[PDB]
Design a protein around this nucleic acid. Structure first.
Lengths: 49, 63, 77
RNA sequence: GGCGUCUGGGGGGAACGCGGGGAAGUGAAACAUCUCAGUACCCGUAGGAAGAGAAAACAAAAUGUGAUUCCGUGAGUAGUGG
RNA sequence: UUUGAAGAAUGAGCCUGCGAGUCAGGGACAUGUCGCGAGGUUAACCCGGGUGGGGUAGCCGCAGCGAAAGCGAGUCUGAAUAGGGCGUAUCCACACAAGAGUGUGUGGUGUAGUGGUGUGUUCUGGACCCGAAGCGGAGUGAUCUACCCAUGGCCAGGGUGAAG
RNA sequence: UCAAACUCCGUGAUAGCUGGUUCUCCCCGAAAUGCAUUUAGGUGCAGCGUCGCAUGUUUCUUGCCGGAGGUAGAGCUACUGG
RNA sequence: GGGGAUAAGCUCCGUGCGUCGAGAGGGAAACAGCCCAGAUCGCCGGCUAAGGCCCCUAAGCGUGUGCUAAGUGGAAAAGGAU
RNA sequence: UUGUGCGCCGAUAAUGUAGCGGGGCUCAAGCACACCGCCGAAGCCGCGGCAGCCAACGUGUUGGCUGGGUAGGGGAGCGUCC
RNA sequence: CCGGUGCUGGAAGGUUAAGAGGACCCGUUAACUCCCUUUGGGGGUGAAGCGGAGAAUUUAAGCCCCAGUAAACGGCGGUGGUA
RNA sequence: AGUUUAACUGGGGCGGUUGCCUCCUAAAAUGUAACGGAGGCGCCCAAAGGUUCCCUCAACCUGGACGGCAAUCAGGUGUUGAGUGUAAGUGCACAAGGGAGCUUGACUGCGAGACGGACAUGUCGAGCAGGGACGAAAGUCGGGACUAGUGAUCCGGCACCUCUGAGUGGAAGGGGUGUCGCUCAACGGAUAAAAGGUACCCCGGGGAUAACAGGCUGAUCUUCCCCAAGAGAUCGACGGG
């Protein structure tokens, strides 16, 4: 639709998932953002699932 | 006839060591995207039952 | 008629007045804009709420034309 | 099928038994799942009682109980439930 | 019953009788009272011609925290002695910390429940009493009336004048 | 007796509705508001009564002191509108 | 203060406002909501409040200084009026 | 002419005076301003009885306050039967 | 007037139940293979069997579809100009 | 055959409304009703978020090829009249308004103390630890100038966990943490699932509540009157009691 709910699984496995929204036509490609992952305890990149 | 206790109240309320009645806070099942983590943190855990509802919950639990 | 819609009252305003002693973290005013500006030992919140950063007594003053709220460190016994 | 001859049955009864069929008012502050309730009622059958009964059972590693029935607990608990 | 009715809101002709918060349950909560007291108490049942004696199975107190595994005066969350939540009867004294509200320890002090029964509420029962239109189950009715079936009866007198 | 007869039974059906509820005295003494409600004549919680316990004047009145307002009034080449 | 035609014995809000509700007694002719005043009981005692003092009707056809001619007193406007 | 205190028309519906409570009142019993008395309540005081709360001293006396009341809360009793 | 809804007739296609079908996957473990330590547990692969979920494919009426029918239920118009 | 078919309504019916945000009513704390008066919302932004640094508009005057009231350029005046994603309000020129560089804090574990509140919700928050962004540093950063952009519980889905696993080992199922699925918009959400007629009507209540009559008021009605513009004694407009 636009700004739907999207999930960022921790690239470093861990199944750490952040959620947020984005405009799926402003950014049709998958979102990539570097975020803190609790179990690893480090700032690893996160990829849209 | 022995009294029958309320099933839902038994599933929703607890008693602590000194007899305090303790419940869980609502608004924490779904729709947790737009909710900030501070809101979900203040909604986490258990609180004691308010004084207004104490008599009703005690009645629903004991019998 | 079109009318009939209104929002709830937000209970804004000043919570502690001049001379009242407060603890750190206590809310001083609830305002929309910066009608009062933070002074000494007074912080500003996300909704532009003023609160105390240290214990003491509320003092209302003006700084360069703006009404400000400050906390005075009352003397220890 | 007919004829003859012997032995049974038929119906009544207050409660209790067993096996079948099976409501609605009501409650859920409405109502259909659910409740009422396997109740009311009905059908078939007994006996002095009936039914059940002698493990294709429980149990949980105890070198454990040992047919059935009924009573008290377990327990308004484990659970189950628009 | 009402904001409000002396009544033009309600009910009552009169008298005498009768007529509405009761009972059950080791039910639940609170509060009296009695017994025992870190314990209290039995149920079914057994034996007594009784209201008495026995009966430990259970139940409630005696440790909590946690979803749970589990640990335990602690425990849960958490990477964390890093804060919070719940718990360690309560008070007192002494210290060491802080004046972000008081805390952390060392000694003492020592913690009260449970079983009868009274009372007030309460649960399940018709549950203070009275009062429908209606809903289900099983039966009874067509001697009234509606229609039909079988078999009988009745229709004074006077006109008109079809077919053939 | 008929927009679903009558009788008995379920049954003491159910009515947020209407009516009724019986001796005495002593002390205290309301409310007709807020929120929610398939809610508006009902109900839940709060507000206001009473009883018990705990706590003590913390309640209240008057004087003084420290505070924030945007009403009445007034004003407008201080703004916006007529 | 809003709504209504600032009309209603209309309606809806605010008020450490009052009274009635749940309040007797005195006054306003009568008169829940106005004024005075909060009834523990008795008295063939006294002083007062509101309101009154010619007679009904308790107490002054009270005193002093002025006004009114309209029974004004003892209901009402714009306006009119030697 | 100016302001003034009282007055006049405006004023005007259908049972019966009916817009002083009545009689009546200007020889005010009308109005204004001063003054003096008295009447007037279950208010206050006087004398006597009772009760609740509290205080003091005592082993129940005294004293101070209080005692309208619906819904309702608490306390103490009368009468009936077994 | 057969557009709507019924009714009657017809299936060339679309859709579609049960039943047949059981690919693929998953659980279990005979067997092995790696460890990692010492007074046997911790990882992987995994036949058959037994189970659990089950896909492609096949499949009728109905519906969609194609016609007819009003003495079937029903329906039967506006605007501007002009001698 | 069993049922459903909401509420508000100055009596009903048509209509409109039901949740959230902003102003007035609202009587200078807060709060305050009406089918009272005005508007908006059910989003948007990967930058319009974080940080560091820099800048200051609109309007007017003057001068400039098209070019004009009004495009872009220059000088001057200009303290807020511009603009702030979006209603309105309170703010913001110290900028929260305009520009650029790097970046993901649109974090994880928490949280003294508070505001608001019937309850359920809701709101602010210093500070501590981990691991980061920007910055020389001090420091700031737990989305956005602020206040709307939302939906409890139940039930189910997905990911992870050193939870559990009905004799045992597994597994199924259950549990925790994170999160997803409701114009449940009648927005505290009676069911997963629901429209009408009754003049054939019945029952129980209600003057809460109306119909006819009254009691009150007067938009309207009528009986008059006030000034006199006029026509010409009689009619009297325009206004007024």
């Amino acid at each position: 639709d636009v700004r739907p709910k999207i999930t960022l699984a921790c690239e470093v496995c861990k199944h750490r998932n952040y959620i947020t929204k984005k405009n799926r036509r402003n950014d049709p490609d998958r979102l990539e953002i570097k975020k803190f992952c609790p179990n690893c305890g480090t700032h690893q990149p996160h990829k849209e699932s | 006839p022995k009294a029958k206790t309320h099933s839902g109240a038994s599933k929703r309320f607890r008693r602590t060591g000194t007899g305090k009645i303790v419940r869980q806070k609502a608004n924490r099942r779904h729709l947790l995207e737009h909710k900030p983590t501070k809101r979900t943190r203040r909604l986490d855990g258990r609180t004691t039952v308010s004084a207004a509802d104490n008599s009703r919950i005690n009645k629903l639990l004991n019998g | 008629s079109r009318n009939g819609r209104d929002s709830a009252a937000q209970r804004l305003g000043v919570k502690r007045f001049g001379g009242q002693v407060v603890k750190a973290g206590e809310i001083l005013v609830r305002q929309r804009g910066t009608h009062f500006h933070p002074g000494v030992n007074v912080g500003r919140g996300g909704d532009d709420t003023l609160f105390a950063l240290a214990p003491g007594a509320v003092e209302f003053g003006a700084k360069r034309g703006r009404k400000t709220v400050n906390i005075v460190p009352v003397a220890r016994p």
